Design a protein around this nucleic acid. Structure first.
Ligand code: K
Ligand code: K
Ligand code: MG
Ligand code: MG
Ligand code: MG
Ligand code: MG
Ligand code: MG
Ligand code: MG
Ligand code: MG
Ligand code: MG
Ligand code: MG
Ligand code: MG
Ligand code: MG
Ligand code: MG
Ligand code: MG
Ligand code: MG
Ligand code: MG
Ligand code: MG
Ligand code: NA
Ligand code: NA
Ligand code: NA
Lengths: 51, 127, 167, 141, 71
RNA sequence: AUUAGGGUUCGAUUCCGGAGAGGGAGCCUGAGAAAUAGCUACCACUUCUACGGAGGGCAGCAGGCGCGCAAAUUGCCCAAUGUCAAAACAAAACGAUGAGGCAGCGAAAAGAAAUAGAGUUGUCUUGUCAUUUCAAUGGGGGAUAUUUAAACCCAUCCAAUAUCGAGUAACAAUUGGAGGACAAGUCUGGUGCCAGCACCCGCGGUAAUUCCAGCUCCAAAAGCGUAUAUUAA
């Protein structure tokens, strides 16, 4: 029919991105990731349970 | 760190006497441990003239100075001519213009080219 | 046009983009030596690969082949000069055993850190980038500067730096 | 089994030359039929004009109306079907719009559940279609 | 070379048979070249005879060699 | 280029060789040309004209129009490298050179490299956290100047009596992903075989690990996707 083009994208409620503090760039970002992955079965993005 | 007066010390390397062009040729390296910026060429000229017992400083030619990375030292090339006449006779004109006794710049080459191309259409008296 | 200045690449990407063990080992090397990106490890990898390929080609030859006597001597000289190999070992077979930390240990960042002029490799990096470090009175601003064994005793703060003799 | 003779080089050369034609990729690389039949004429992209917006039903077991455009290529007047590659991106495309087309990733093979299409839209009116999708640009005129 | 034909007047065709090596297959190919050679009446070569020939200035459209000896 | 080896593939393009100057063919001069910013003629196109006539050849440089997916300034200069020449330079007296060099544009590609470093109190041996303290440094602004033919870049410096500047260091990093291949969520909303995704396998039909989004996380990072070729696989 071609009339339903963009249905879901237009339907999706618009949610604003929230103002987060700025992450370090470059070598400091690697420093942060190293000090999180080490010096602290590992799950890198563990989520809370939910249904 | 102690605050002190800016000092400049001249050194000379690969010295050669050139009878053919009436001059001495050498690399000049300057050491300026506490100098704000670059030592101007005229200052090095006066220091070199005093160092080499040259009667007049205008017969010293200096060019192509490369400051070292990290500061405190610059290196260039130097020429000491037997007299002022030899300097003005043998020097490239741009270096003479640097020292203030060069020739005036000729008109723009585009205009010279255009006038030369106009004349190719003309016979004797007119062109 | 009619310009004959050479250039070449110094690094190569890994063949497998997501190996968990390789990724973890590289992140470790980045954290412990304070690197900015994986390209630095991969540059060391290319250097090591070239050296090892040369050593294999040389060892395949008979021991008294003039090419072996020349180039093996040169490569041993370079490895001893830059501290990649210990001066005790002098055979051609010890280049084959060189590892990435062996080269990474000779970076100016790691050397400045190990010399106590910096509190960490991250302090050493910014110290080098800010012209506070001189090797034999020459300011060196490159953290990947590979330090010769002879230059290790001449690494101090730069004279022009406020940590040396500067304003 | 193969010939082994020390002076049997000609047999081996002729044999390899003959059998190299059985490799489909080599034959396609060393003949003109694919390049002639290829609407892009061997190019990576081609510019065209949008004739009409059409809906192509996805193949079983999928069920969808894949939004495509019929486009006539500027260089050779060939007519193709090209996919519009995101959600609601069909509204960025109008009839007679100038459009840049690329391959679909499989070198002329049809891709996914879209039955007989090997092309997709990447630009319209000289701006990136994905750029319009993310509202990074505006459509001229 | 070996004499291949004596049909022409004062001119003969010789063959230079050789093996050509194909690097990829590490093997050889039989190949031959043919040269038209002027033959002086001082020689009477036959088909299958071996001849030594020497290069000279062009003597015709094809002839660039002269029979120097018949083995 | 790719490659353990054997190979596969690309080579219009900087050096060497050949060829051509819209197409064809002739030719004069000359040591050397079948020369084309030489001549002659025809064929196409094409410019000026007072209609008698007379002209043209960018596959040189720059720049147009077209063609295309696809490629810069109608810039400066002969300072360097060379060529020619009746010619060293200079002295009334400066040879020509879009060859060449220099700059502009230029994320083809290549090298180096920022986007922070040390802390204090408590909170929770580390490590995150709200702080609240220090120094350091470039990006940038400038200069006694330096460089350059002149400019511009790089370097040098922020007194040598006398020289600016970071705290949301807002001077705020992106591009693709998170079911498998393949690193990373059995999170939360929306949709309901639709919209869409998906190179392949597949996901979506009301509890979507796959779509549209927020959050979080992953990979590479001043880069990262996509298409088409090609090499390995
Ligand atoms: K010519
Ligand atoms: K340029
Ligand atoms: Mg070529
Ligand atoms: Mg050529
Ligand atoms: Mg010619
Ligand atoms: Mg033309
Ligand atoms: Mg001609
Ligand atoms: Mg021309
Ligand atoms: Mg009249
Ligand atoms: Mg003509
Ligand atoms: Mg042009
Ligand atoms: Mg061309
Ligand atoms: Mg041009
Ligand atoms: Mg381009
Ligand atoms: Mg040129
Ligand atoms: Mg739901
Ligand atoms: Mg859901
Ligand atoms: Mg599921
Ligand atoms: Na389905
Ligand atoms: Na998601
Ligand atoms: Na997505």
């Amino acid at each position: 029919s071609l009339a339903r083009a963009g249905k879901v994208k237009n339907q999706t409620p618009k949610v604003a991105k929230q103002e987060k503090p700025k992450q370090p760039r470059g070598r400091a970002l690697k420093r942060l990731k190293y000090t999180r992955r080490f010096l602290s079965k590992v799950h890198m993005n563990k989520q809370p349970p939910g249904k | 760190f102690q605050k002190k007066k800016a000092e400049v010390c001249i050194r000379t390397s690969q010295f050669k006497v050139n009878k053919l062009l009436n001059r001495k040729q050498f690399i000049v390296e300057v050491n300026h441990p506490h100098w704000c910026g670059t030592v101007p060429t005229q200052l090095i000229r006066k220091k070199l003239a005093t160092l080499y017992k040259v009667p007049d400083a205008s017969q010293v030619s200096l060019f192509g100075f490369k400051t070292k990375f990290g500061g405190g030292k610059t290196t260039g090339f130097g020429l000491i001519y037997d007299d002022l006449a030899s300097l003005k006779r043998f020097e490239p004109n741009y270096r003479k213009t640097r020292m203030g006794f060069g020739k005036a710049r000729l008109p723009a080459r585009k205009s010279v080219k255009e006038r030369r191309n106009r004349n190719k259409k003309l016979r004797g008296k007119a062109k | 046009m009619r310009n004959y200045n050479n250039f070449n690449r110094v690094w190569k990407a890994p063949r497998r983009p997501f190996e968990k063990e390789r990724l973890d080992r590289e992140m470790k090397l980045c954290g412990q030596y304070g690197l900015r990106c994986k390209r630095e490890i991969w540059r060391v990898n290319m250097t090591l690969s070239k050296m090892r390929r040369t050593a294999r080609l040389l060892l395949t030859l008979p021991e008294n082949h003039p090419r072996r006597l020349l180039e093996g001597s040169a490569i041993m000289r370079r490895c001893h000069e830059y501290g990649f190999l210990d001066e005790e070992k002098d055979k051609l077979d010890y280049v084959l055993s060189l590892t990435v930390p062996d080269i990474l240990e000779r970076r100016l960042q790691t050397i400045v850190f190990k010399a106590g002029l910096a509190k960490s490799v991250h302090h050493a990096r910014v110290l080098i980038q800010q012209r506070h470090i001189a090797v034999a009175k020459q300011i060196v601003t490159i953290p990947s500067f590979i330090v010769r064994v002879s230059s290790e005793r001449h690494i101090a703060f730069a004279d022009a730096s406020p940590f040396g003799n500067g304003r | 089994t193969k010939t082994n003779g020390q002076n049997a080089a000609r047999k081996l050369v002729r044999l390899r030359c003959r059998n190299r034609w059985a490799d489909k990729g080599w034959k396609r690389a060393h003949t003109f039929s694919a390049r002639k039949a290829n609407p892009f004429g061997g190019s990576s992209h081609a510019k065209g004009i949008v004739l009409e917006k059409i809906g192509v039903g996805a193949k079983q077991p999928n069920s969808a109306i894949r939004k495509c455009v019929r486009v006539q290529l500027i260089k050779n007047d060939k007519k193709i079907i090209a996919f519009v590659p995101n959600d609601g991106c069909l509204h960025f495309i109008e009839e007679n719009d100038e459009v840049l087309v690329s391959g679909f990733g499989r070198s002329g093979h049809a891709v996914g559940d879209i039955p007989g299409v090997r092309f997709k839209i990447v630009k319209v009116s000289n701006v990136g279609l994905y750029a319009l999708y993310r509202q990074k640009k505006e459509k001229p005129r | 070379g070996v004499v291949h034909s004596t049909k022409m007047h004062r001119t003969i065709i010789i063959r230079r048979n050789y093996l050509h090596f194909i690097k990829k297959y590490q093997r050889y190919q039989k190949r031959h070249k043919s040269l038209a050679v002027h033959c002086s009446p001082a020689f009477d070569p036959k088909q299958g005879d071996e001849v030594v020939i020497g290069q000279c200035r062009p003597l015709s459209k094809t002839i660039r060699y002269n029979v120097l000896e018949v083995v």
